[PDB]
Structure formats: C-alpha cells, structure tokens
Amino acid sequence: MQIFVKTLTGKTITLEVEPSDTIENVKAKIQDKEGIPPDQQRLIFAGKQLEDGRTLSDYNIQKESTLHLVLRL
Amino acid sequence: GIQKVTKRLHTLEEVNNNVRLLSEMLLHYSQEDSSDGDRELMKELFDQCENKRRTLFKLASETEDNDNSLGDILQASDNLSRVINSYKTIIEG
Structure with missing residues (x-):
C-alpha cells in the first residue's frame, strides 16, 4: 500500500507500507527516506496523533491516505 | 519578481x-x-500559529497600496486568528 506524509514546511514525502504496519517502522521508514530520527516525529491522521505501540489498521488508514508530519524540537 | 511569487x-x-x-x-x-501528546501537540501547533499570524503582520507592514498581496495576507491572518480564538474556547471548554 502507498501512503503520503505532508509536512508543514511543504515537503510531501510518499511512502510504502502495509495497512497493518506499526508506527514504529512507519517512522523509521520515513527516517529511511528523510533521515529524521523517529524520537522526533509526529504523525497526525484525522486530528489525532499516532502512538508507537499501534499500527495503521488501529487508526484505519486507507490506501493512498495522507498523514501530517510535524517535528518535536 | 522571478520566484518571489512562489x-x-x-x-x-x-x-x-x-x-x-x-x-x-x-x-x-x-x-x-x-491523550497527553495529542492535545499538547495542538497547544504546540497553537504557539507556532500565533507567530506566523504575527509574521503575516510584518509582511503586511511592508506593503504599499498593493492589491491581492495585502488581501491575501490579511485573509490568511484572519483564519489564523479565527482558529486561535477557536482553540482558546475549545480547550477551555
């Protein structure tokens, strides 16, 4: 499955994940593209943040669904 | 003039x-x-919101009888404010 991750600055990174993929990897997956340590990421789908011990099927993320990435300075 | 539009x-x-x-x-x-991080984030998006709204004022403050530019600058600022007060309430309620 293919999802997106729009940030505030503008960068619209495009990812490859499994509907029931853990946010743990999702992040390191973004990390593998943009190089941003996970311990400094923040995903937001439907006005809500996405904890680590969960997946995508836990937040229900269709194919080609957009996620918001913000950085915790 | 070139990409100053972008x-x-x-x-x-x-x-x-x-x-x-x-x-x-x-x-x-x-x-x-x-959750704690859920809302707190909001309150953090909130802080950065008051700022940009402030920047939009600075770019305003540097415009002389210019079409759109101001209209567009003041318009965005206007949602920024709307959301700022919006937040104020929703959080306090």
Missing part, C-alpha cells in the same frame, strides 16, 4: 496548512477522550 505562495501554504491541522485536532478533541 516564495510567497509558499508561506501562504504553510499558514493555511496549520490552520487546517489545528482545527482538525480540535474537531476530534474531547475532554476525557484524548
């Missing part, structure tokens, strides 16, 4: 962006129903 729209995208992601979190925001 560098512009680029700041606008950022403004509307937040105004978007903040009112999104407010919508799914309930007292008991919500």
Whole structure:
C-alpha cells in the first residue's frame, strides 16, 4: 500500500507500507527516506496523533491516505 | 519578481496548512477522550500559529497600496486568528 506524509514546511514525502504496519517502522521508514530520527516525529491522521505501540489498521488508514508530519524540537 | 511569487505562495501554504491541522485536532478533541501528546501537540501547533499570524503582520507592514498581496495576507491572518480564538474556547471548554 502507498501512503503520503505532508509536512508543514511543504515537503510531501510518499511512502510504502502495509495497512497493518506499526508506527514504529512507519517512522523509521520515513527516517529511511528523510533521515529524521523517529524520537522526533509526529504523525497526525484525522486530528489525532499516532502512538508507537499501534499500527495503521488501529487508526484505519486507507490506501493512498495522507498523514501530517510535524517535528518535536 | 522571478520566484518571489512562489516564495510567497509558499508561506501562504504553510499558514493555511496549520490552520487546517489545528482545527482538525480540535474537531476530534474531547475532554476525557484524548491523550497527553495529542492535545499538547495542538497547544504546540497553537504557539507556532500565533507567530506566523504575527509574521503575516510584518509582511503586511511592508506593503504599499498593493492589491491581492495585502488581501491575501490579511485573509490568511484572519483564519489564523479565527482558529486561535477557536482553540482558546475549545480547550477551555
């Protein structure tokens, strides 16, 4: 499955994940593209943040669904 | 003149962006129903919101009888404010 991750600055990174993929990897997956340590990421789908011990099927993320990435300075 | 038009729209995208992601979190925001990082983030998006709204004032303050530019600058600022007060309430309620 293919999802997106729009940030505030503008960068619209495009990812490859499994509907029931853990946010743990999702992040390191973004990390593998943009190089941003996970311990400094923040995903937001439907006005809500996405904890680590969960997946995508836990937040229900269709194919080609957009996620918001913000950085915790 | 060249890409100063983009560098512009680029700041606008950022403004509307937040105004978007903040009112999104407010919508799914309930007292008991919500986490610590969930809301706190909002309150953080909130801080950065007051700022850009402030920047939009600086770019305003540097415009002489210019069409759109101001209209567009003041418009975004206007949602920024709307969302700022919006947040104020929703969080306090």
